[PDB]
Amino acid sequence: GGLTDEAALSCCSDADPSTKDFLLQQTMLRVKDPKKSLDFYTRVLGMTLIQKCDFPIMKFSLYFLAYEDKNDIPKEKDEKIAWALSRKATLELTHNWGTEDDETQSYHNGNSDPRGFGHIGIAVPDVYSACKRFEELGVKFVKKPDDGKMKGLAFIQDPDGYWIEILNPNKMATLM
Amino acid sequence: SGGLTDEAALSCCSDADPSTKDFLLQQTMLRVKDPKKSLDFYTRVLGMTLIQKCDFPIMKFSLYFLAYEDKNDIPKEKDEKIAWALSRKATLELTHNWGTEDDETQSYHNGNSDPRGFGHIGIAVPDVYSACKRFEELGVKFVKKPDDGKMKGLAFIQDPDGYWIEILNPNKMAT
Numbered sequence: 001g002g003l004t005d006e007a008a009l010s011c012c013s014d015a016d017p018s019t020k021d022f023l024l025q026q027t028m029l030r031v032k033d034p035k036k037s038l039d040f041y042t043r044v045l046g047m048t049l050i051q052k053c054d055f056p057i058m059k060f061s062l063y064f065l066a067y068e069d070k071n072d073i074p075k076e077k078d079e080k081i082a083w084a085l086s087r088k089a090t091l092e093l094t095h096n097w098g099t100e101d102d103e104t105q106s107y108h109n110g111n112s113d114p115r116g117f118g119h120i121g122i123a124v125p126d127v128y129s130a131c132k133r134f135e136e137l138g139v140k141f142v143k144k145p146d147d148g149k150m151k152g153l154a155f156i157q158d159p160d161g162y163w164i165e166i167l168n169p170n171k172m173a174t175l176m
Numbered sequence: 177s178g179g180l181t182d183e184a185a186l187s188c189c190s191d192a193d194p195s196t197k198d199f200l201l202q203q204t205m206l207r208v209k210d211p212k213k214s215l216d217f218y219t220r221v222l223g224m225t226l227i228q229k230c231d232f233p234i235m236k237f238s239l240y241f242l243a244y245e246d247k248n249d250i251p252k253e254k255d256e257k258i259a260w261a262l263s264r265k266a267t268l269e270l271t272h273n274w275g276t277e278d279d280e281t282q283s284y285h286n287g288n289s290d291p292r293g294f295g296h297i298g299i300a301v302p303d304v305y306s307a308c309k310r311f312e313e314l315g316v317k318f319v320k321k322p323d324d325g326k327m328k329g330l331a332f333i334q335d336p337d338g339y340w341i342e343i344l345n346p347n348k349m350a351t
């Protein structure tokens with residue numbers, strides 16, 4: 001039966017003053033082909049690329065994506081990194097050079113064994129209109145809004161097969 | 177490859193379609209073996225707040241939503257609470273499948289060993305070294321202490337499932 005509400009709450013402590021300005025800054029996903037990933041996240045989901053880092057010795061690049069106004073990205077390089085890495089709710093996409101041409105290689109999405117990570121989730125003003133647009137753009141769906149018993153809630157998949165939940169906060173008060 | 181030039185990157189980027197203008201990155205979902213340890217670590221050790229819990233007695237799971245929010249902004253009424261909680265940016269959604277906490281042969285995978293995908297979440301903090309001194313005192317397991325290895329000034333800890341959490345100071349990043 002899992003925890004009651006009260007039991008769950010008893011397991012929680014109020015935050016220590018030392019953690020007062022902490023923020024949940026990023027979730028990192030490895031991506032096979034950064035070309036396909038950047039197109040998906042900016043053109044399909046409307047995020048902005050806010051920072052790109054290359055490491056030639058380790059052979060990887062990092063791409064920071066966020067729902068930010070690109071007008072707010074600062075022009076100087078040092079201040080740009082500090083602002084990008086102080087933004088809440090970024091997605092960090094790691095590209096290990098070479099994966100895009102390797103026909104055997106693919107990453108795992110965490111939704112089959114071995115499982116752990118499940119999905120990221122985008123809050124939208126309207127799941128039906130978002131998902132209609134998605135359909136028109138050729139996006140691959142895991143669960144259309146009306147499929148299954150959780151009506152009004154959908155999952156799509158990025159080019160790597162990672163799941164993305166599409167949810168409408170103003171409607172979710174309709175199941176427990 | 178040598179990976180993408182900055183220009184080739186930008187060329188794969190589109191401006192945000194107006195249909196997306198109010199979208200927000202609302203959650204990252206992790207499955208947790210035992211919600212008791214997970215709630216303790218993310219509140220008491222990391223300073224997050226539990227803002228919503230949901231239970232699904234038929235499908236035998238619960239969801240716990242965790243976020244850096246003042247507990248006094250949480251609405252008192254339940255329906256409003258959900259709307260508020262599931263509209264916050266940057267929440268962590270922990271899924272408990274009932275019974276896992278008692279199963280000695282069951283563990284989740286953190287993405288950082290074959291087969292890889294997900295890599296970590298990350299917390300921006302004002303002071304990586306002080307934060308990590310406190311983590312150590314509280315018994316936190318480390319993947320990478322701040323001065324271990326090449327990238328000095330950045331850490332990785334693990335939660336009770338072994339998921340990697342980066343600890344970074346945005347103003348120190350970029351050597």
Ligand SMILES: COc1c(/C=C/C(=O)c2ccc(O)cc2)ccc(O)c1O
Binds near residue numbers: 320349
């Ligand atoms: C992907 O996360 C990053 C990286 C991360 C780069 C890594 O590949 C890495 C993996 C394991 C380890 O123990 C150390 C580094 C480097 C800089 C940065 O700011 C950031 O957010």
Ligand SMILES: COc1c(/C=C\C(=O)c2ccc(O)cc2)ccc(O)c1O
Binds near residue numbers: 143172205
């Ligand atoms: C874990 O993410 C969630 C879920 C998650 C669970 C789902 O119902 C689900 C449905 C179909 C499928 O193919 C996979 C999972 C349910 C409600 C919610 O608010 C939320 O954020």
Ligand SMILES: [Zn+2]
Binds near residue numbers: 296298342
């Ligand atoms: Zn990172």
Ligand SMILES: [Zn+2]
Binds near residue numbers: 119121165203205269
């Ligand atoms: Zn979810």
